[PDB]
Amino acid sequence: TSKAYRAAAAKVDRTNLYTPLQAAKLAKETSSTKQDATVEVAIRLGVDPRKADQMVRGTVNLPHGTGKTARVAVFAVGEKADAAVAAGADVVGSDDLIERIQGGWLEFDAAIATPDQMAKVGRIARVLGPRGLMPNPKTGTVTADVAKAVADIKGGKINFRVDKQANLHFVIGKASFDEKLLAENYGAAIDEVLRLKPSSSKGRYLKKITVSTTTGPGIPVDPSITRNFA
Amino acid sequence: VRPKITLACEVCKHRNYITKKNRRNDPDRLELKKFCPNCGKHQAHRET
RNA sequence: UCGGUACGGUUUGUGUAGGAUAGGUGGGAGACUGUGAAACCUCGACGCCAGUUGGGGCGGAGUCGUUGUUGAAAUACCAC
RNA sequence: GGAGCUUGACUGCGAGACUUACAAGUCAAGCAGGGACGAAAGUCGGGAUUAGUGAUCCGGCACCCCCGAGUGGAAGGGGUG
RNA sequence: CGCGGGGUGGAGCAGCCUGGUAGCUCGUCGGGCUCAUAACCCGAAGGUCGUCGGUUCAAAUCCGGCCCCCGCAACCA
Numbered sequence: 375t376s377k378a379y380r381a382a383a384a385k386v387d388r389t390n391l392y393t394p395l396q397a398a399k400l401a402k403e404t405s406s407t408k409q410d411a412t413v414e415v416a417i418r419l420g421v422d423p424r425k426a427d428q429m430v431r432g433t434v435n436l437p438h439g440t441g442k443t444a445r446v447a448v449f450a451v452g453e454k455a456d457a458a459v460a461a462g463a464d465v466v467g468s469d470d471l472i473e474r475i476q477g478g479w480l481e482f483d484a485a486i487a488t489p490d491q492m493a494k495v496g497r498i499a500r501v502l503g504p505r506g507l508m509p510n511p512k513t514g515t516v517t518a519d520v521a522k523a524v525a526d527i528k529g530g531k532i533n534f535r536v537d538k539q540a541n542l543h544f545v546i547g548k549a550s551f552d553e554k555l556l557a558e559n560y561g562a563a564i565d566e567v568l569r570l571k572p573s574s575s576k577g578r579y580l581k582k583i584t585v586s587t588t589t590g591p592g593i594p595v596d597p598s599i600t601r602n603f604a
Numbered sequence: 605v606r607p608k609i610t611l612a613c614e615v616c617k618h619r620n621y622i623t624k625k626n627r628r629n630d631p632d633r634l635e636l637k638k639f640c641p642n643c644g645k646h647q648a649h650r651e652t
Numbered sequence: 653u654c655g656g657u658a659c660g661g662u663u664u665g666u667g668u669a670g671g672a673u674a675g676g677u678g679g680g681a682g683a684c685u686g687u688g689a690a691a692c693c694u695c696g697a698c699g700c701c702a703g704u705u706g707g708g709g710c711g712g713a714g715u716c717g718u719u720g721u722u723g724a725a726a727u728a729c730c731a732c
Numbered sequence: 733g734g735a736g737c738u739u740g741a742c743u744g745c746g747a748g749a750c751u752u753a754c755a756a757g758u759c760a761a762g763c764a765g766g767g768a769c770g771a772a773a774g775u776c777g778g779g780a781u782u783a784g785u786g787a788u789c790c791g792g793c794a795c796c797c798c799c800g801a802g803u804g805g806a807a808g809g810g811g812u813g
Numbered sequence: 814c815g816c817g818g819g820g821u822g823g824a825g826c827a828g829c830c831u832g833g834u835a836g837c838u839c840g841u842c843g844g845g846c847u848c849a850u851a852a853c854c855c856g857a858a859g860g861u862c863g864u865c866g867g868u869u870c871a872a873a874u875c876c877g878g879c880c881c882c883c884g885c886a887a888c889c890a
């Protein structure tokens with residue numbers, strides 16, 4: 375079924391591995407084919423994530439943005455909030471800002487709080503429960519640099535984390551970008567995964583990689599190319 | 605019950621010394637300051 | 653005739669709480685009907701409460717998660 | 733006999749002796765490096781002392797980076813523990 | 814030294830690959846019936862699932878370190 379999906383499936387080949395340029399060249403021809411969404415990257419690694427020291431986790435600075443609003447409320451006191459309104463955070467307050475969100479307009483994305491204020495801000499998670507806007511050290515939002523970590527959210531620091539079955543599922547941004555501008559994202563993101571190779575990674579490290587949307591099919595990519603994205 | 609254990613430096617990892625402990629009275633690895641001839645000074649030494 | 657291996661399609665998954673949305677991860681409100689929607693029939697598939705159903709037979713345009721759980725939360729839908 | 737802190741149960745050496753068919757065995761002042769204890773003098777190269785052990789060959793592991801069968805490497809070898 | 818499994822109630826053994834309950838057998842206790850708990854019958858005690866840590870909301874199960882047995886193939890100058 376799905377007559378709009380077979381039309382893209384009668385286009386991309388299975389028995390060929392494409393270049394990173396051709397991968398975004400059909401991602402634009404899938405986001406023209408389908409209704410537009412995020413370009414997904416599924417990396418299949420040669421690690422075993424059941425041993426502890428082969429676990430892969432990290433982030434990436436995409437130089438063309440991940441296509442995200444990044445509305446930030448900053449729960450801090452003193453200059454720590456004042457360094458965030460100068461950073462470019464639109465909703466900046468104090469213990470007052472505890473009150474302005476739990477009653478209404480809980481419309482932001484991250485809450486980077488100081489470790490001294492984690493008690494009173496932690497009750498806002500009772501309305502920020504299913505959306506994960508609570509201050510979290512696991513997302514880089516509880517630290518001593520509560521100011522310029524908002525700028526990490528603005529530019530598109532996408533955190534990755536390998537699953538139980540050695541797969542990195544991963545994004546490069548919205549599909550409204552240029553084809554050569556997606557390979558700038560896609561090039562400077564694989565190399566970030568190449569940074570986090572453990573020494574005990576037996577075998578071939580980046581075995582299989584594919585490029586898909588959340589609406590169209592996947593694209594077979596050649597893992598041989600790690601430098602020549604330009 | 606009294607095995608021959610070797611002591612390695614905690615910096616350069618050279619196996620400078622060999623000795624004996626009791627496997628039952630001291631069931632974990634020894635820690636002693638010993639002279640490391642590579643570093644030219646006293647370093648810490650665990651087992652291997 | 654019974655396998656092994658490389659690869660594709662199909663399908664599988666039921667502590668309690670609770671959508672009956674019932675494997676992990678990702679993001680996912682538009683994929684969703686001539687690719688002829690829903691009702692209705694029942695050649696079947698399995699079994700642990702309601703079949704999740706690969707039945708391909710009947711239709712004449714939804715087979716929506718923000719509510720109200722499985723960490724809990726989607727699991728319509730797509731890559732893996 | 734009791735107590736406090738410690739790792740000298742050191743590395744580079746060693747004038748001069750004991751014992752002795754030979755191979756072996758044993759003792760050693762003092763010098764330097766880096767240390768422990770002590771206010772200092774000093775003392776410490778396992779244990780009051782003498783038993784608790786096994787030549788060579790052949791290999792194993794760790795380090796040094798000496799040789800490397802035309803050359804560059806590697807294999808293999810060599811030294812030290 | 815490599816590999817190739819195993820430890821779970823007093824003894825024996827599943828569950829482990831694939832994550833949500835600790836069970837079965839024998840022994841014991843108590844009760845019943847009986848010449849005889851020989852048998853048969855019912856109830857219960859007996860467990861950090863070898864110990865440390867680690868990963869997950871949650872581990873007997875999965876990872877790693879440790880003790881502890883059992884095999885095999887060497888090494889054995």
Ligand SMILES: [Mg+2]
Pocket residue numbers: 629630
């Ligand atoms: Mg002791």
Ligand SMILES: [Mg+2]
Pocket residue numbers: 622623741
């Ligand atoms: Mg000694």
Ligand SMILES: [Mg+2]
Pocket residue numbers: 746
């Ligand atoms: Mg001499």
Ligand SMILES: [Mg+2]
Pocket residue numbers: none
């Ligand atoms: Mg001195």
Ligand SMILES: [Mg+2]
Pocket residue numbers: none
């Ligand atoms: Mg002093």
Ligand SMILES: [Mg+2]
Pocket residue numbers: none
């Ligand atoms: Mg002396």
Ligand SMILES: [Mg+2]
Pocket residue numbers: 789
């Ligand atoms: Mg000989």
Ligand SMILES: [Mg+2]
Pocket residue numbers: none
């Ligand atoms: Mg040569």
Ligand SMILES: [Mg+2]
Pocket residue numbers: none
């Ligand atoms: Mg060599």
Ligand SMILES: [Mg+2]
Pocket residue numbers: none
């Ligand atoms: Mg020498």
Ligand SMILES: [Zn+2]
Pocket residue numbers: 613614615616617618640642643647
């Ligand atoms: Zn050293």
